[PDB]
Short mmCIF file of all heavy atoms in Angstrom, two decimals:
data_model
loop_
_atom_site.label_atom_id
_atom_site.label_comp_id
_atom_site.label_asym_id
_atom_site.label_seq_id
_atom_site.Cartn_x
_atom_site.Cartn_y
_atom_site.Cartn_z
N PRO B 273 -31.22 -3.35 -22.04
CA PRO B 273 -32.35 -2.41 -22.00
C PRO B 273 -31.89 -0.99 -21.74
O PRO B 273 -30.74 -0.73 -21.37
CB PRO B 273 -33.19 -2.94 -20.84
CG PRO B 273 -32.80 -4.36 -20.69
CD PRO B 273 -31.35 -4.41 -21.03
N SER B 274 -32.81 -0.05 -21.94
CA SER B 274 -32.43 1.35 -21.90
C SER B 274 -32.42 1.93 -20.50
O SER B 274 -31.67 2.88 -20.24
CB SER B 274 -33.35 2.18 -22.79
OG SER B 274 -33.00 3.54 -22.72
N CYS B 275 -33.25 1.42 -19.58
CA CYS B 275 -33.20 2.01 -18.25
C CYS B 275 -32.01 1.45 -17.49
O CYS B 275 -31.62 0.30 -17.70
CB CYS B 275 -34.49 1.75 -17.48
SG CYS B 275 -34.78 0.05 -17.03
N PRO B 276 -31.39 2.24 -16.63
CA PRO B 276 -30.16 1.80 -15.96
C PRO B 276 -30.41 0.78 -14.87
O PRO B 276 -29.54 -0.04 -14.58
CB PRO B 276 -29.61 3.09 -15.37
CG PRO B 276 -30.28 4.16 -16.12
CD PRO B 276 -31.62 3.68 -16.41
N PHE B 277 -31.60 0.83 -14.27
CA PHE B 277 -31.87 0.03 -13.08
C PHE B 277 -31.98 -1.45 -13.41
O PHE B 277 -31.40 -2.28 -12.71
CB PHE B 277 -33.15 0.52 -12.41
CG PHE B 277 -33.10 1.94 -11.99
CD1 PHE B 277 -33.83 2.89 -12.67
CD2 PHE B 277 -32.36 2.32 -10.90
CE1 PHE B 277 -33.80 4.20 -12.28
CE2 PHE B 277 -32.32 3.64 -10.52
CZ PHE B 277 -33.05 4.57 -11.20
N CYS B 278 -32.70 -1.80 -14.47
CA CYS B 278 -32.86 -3.20 -14.86
C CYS B 278 -31.57 -3.84 -15.32
O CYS B 278 -31.47 -5.07 -15.33
CB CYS B 278 -33.91 -3.34 -15.97
SG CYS B 278 -35.62 -3.03 -15.48
N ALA B 279 -30.57 -3.05 -15.70
CA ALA B 279 -29.31 -3.59 -16.20
C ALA B 279 -28.39 -4.06 -15.08
O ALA B 279 -27.49 -4.85 -15.35
CB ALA B 279 -28.60 -2.54 -17.04
N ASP B 284 -31.38 -1.60 -8.71
CA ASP B 284 -32.82 -1.55 -8.48
C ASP B 284 -33.19 -1.80 -7.03
O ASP B 284 -34.25 -1.34 -6.58
CB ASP B 284 -33.55 -2.54 -9.37
CG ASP B 284 -33.01 -3.94 -9.25
OD1 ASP B 284 -31.96 -4.12 -8.62
OD2 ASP B 284 -33.66 -4.87 -9.78
N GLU B 435 -38.17 -9.26 -16.40
CA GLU B 435 -36.96 -9.07 -17.19
C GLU B 435 -37.16 -7.98 -18.23
O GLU B 435 -36.20 -7.43 -18.76
CB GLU B 435 -36.54 -10.37 -17.87
CG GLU B 435 -37.53 -10.87 -18.91
CD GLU B 435 -37.08 -12.15 -19.56
OE1 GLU B 435 -36.00 -12.66 -19.20
OE2 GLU B 435 -37.81 -12.66 -20.43
N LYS B 436 -38.43 -7.68 -18.54
CA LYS B 436 -38.74 -6.68 -19.55
C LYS B 436 -39.96 -5.85 -19.19
O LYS B 436 -40.51 -5.18 -20.07
CB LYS B 436 -38.95 -7.37 -20.91
CG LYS B 436 -40.08 -8.38 -20.92
CD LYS B 436 -40.16 -9.11 -22.25
CE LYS B 436 -41.28 -10.12 -22.23
NZ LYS B 436 -41.00 -11.19 -21.24
N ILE B 437 -40.38 -5.86 -17.94
CA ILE B 437 -41.52 -5.07 -17.48
C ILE B 437 -40.93 -3.82 -16.85
O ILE B 437 -40.45 -3.84 -15.72
CB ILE B 437 -42.39 -5.86 -16.50
CG1 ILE B 437 -42.84 -7.17 -17.13
CG2 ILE B 437 -43.60 -5.04 -16.10
CD1 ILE B 437 -43.61 -7.00 -18.42
N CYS B 438 -40.96 -2.72 -17.60
CA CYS B 438 -40.36 -1.46 -17.17
C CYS B 438 -41.30 -0.79 -16.17
O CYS B 438 -42.04 0.14 -16.49
CB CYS B 438 -40.07 -0.56 -18.36
SG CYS B 438 -39.23 1.00 -17.96
N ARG B 439 -41.25 -1.28 -14.94
CA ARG B 439 -41.95 -0.64 -13.84
C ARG B 439 -41.12 0.45 -13.18
O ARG B 439 -41.59 1.08 -12.23
CB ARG B 439 -42.37 -1.67 -12.79
CG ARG B 439 -41.27 -2.18 -11.87
CD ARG B 439 -40.51 -3.36 -12.44
NE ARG B 439 -39.69 -3.99 -11.42
CZ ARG B 439 -38.78 -4.94 -11.66
NH1 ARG B 439 -38.58 -5.37 -12.90
NH2 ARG B 439 -38.08 -5.45 -10.67
N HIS B 440 -39.91 0.70 -13.68
CA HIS B 440 -39.05 1.74 -13.15
C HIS B 440 -39.40 3.06 -13.81
O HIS B 440 -39.36 3.18 -15.03
CB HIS B 440 -37.58 1.40 -13.38
CG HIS B 440 -37.12 0.19 -12.65
ND1 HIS B 440 -37.05 -1.05 -13.23
CD2 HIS B 440 -36.73 0.03 -11.36
CE1 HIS B 440 -36.62 -1.93 -12.34
NE2 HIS B 440 -36.41 -1.29 -11.20
N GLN B 441 -39.75 4.05 -12.99
CA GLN B 441 -40.03 5.39 -13.46
C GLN B 441 -38.74 6.02 -14.00
O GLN B 441 -37.64 5.69 -13.55
CB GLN B 441 -40.59 6.20 -12.30
CG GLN B 441 -41.17 7.56 -12.61
CD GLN B 441 -41.76 8.22 -11.39
OE1 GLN B 441 -41.70 7.68 -10.29
NE2 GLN B 441 -42.32 9.40 -11.57
ZN1 LIG C 3 -36.64 -0.78 -15.63
#
Side-chain angles (χ1 to χ4, degrees):
Chain B
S274 178
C275 68
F277 300 108
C278 290
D284 53 350
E435 65 180 0
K436 60 185 180 295
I437 305 301
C438 183
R439 76 273 193 189
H440 295 97
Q441 190 177 2

